[PDB]
Ligand binder design. Structure first.
Ligand SMILES: [Zn+2]
Length: 106
């Protein structure tokens, strides 16, 4: 029964938000695992039927792509991107273009 503290201002209500995990609590809705701390993870804003509202869905660097969430310009569409370092920025780009980790099985 947390109390909570209001007072959050956001200029860009970006749907996605990528940032280095803060703790190992955030769960994943793709592999049903516990996202590791200090790991590159993404977020998705979806409307929950039970929460009758929008909730931040965290998805592993790959999981996010597994579901099938392609991104053309993750530099503006996806938040944090700009915050991320040069390396990461480029990495995310290479992936986004591919549109998937690689189901290459067998
Ligand atoms: Zn996952």
């Amino acid at each position: 029964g947390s109390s909570g503290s209001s007072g959050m201002a956001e200029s860009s209500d970006k749907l996605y938000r990528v940032e280095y995990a803060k703790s190992g609590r955030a769960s994943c809705k793709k592999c049903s695992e516990s996202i590791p701390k200090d790991s590159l993870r993404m977020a998705i804003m979806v409307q929950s039927p039970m929460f009758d509202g929008k909730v931040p869905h965290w998805y592993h660097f790959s999981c996010f792509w597994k579901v099938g969430h392609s991104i053309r310009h993750p530099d503006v569409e996806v938040d944090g991107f700009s915050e991320l370092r040069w390396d990461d920025q480029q990495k995310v780009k290479k992936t986004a273009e591919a549109g998937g980790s690689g189901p290459s099985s067998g």
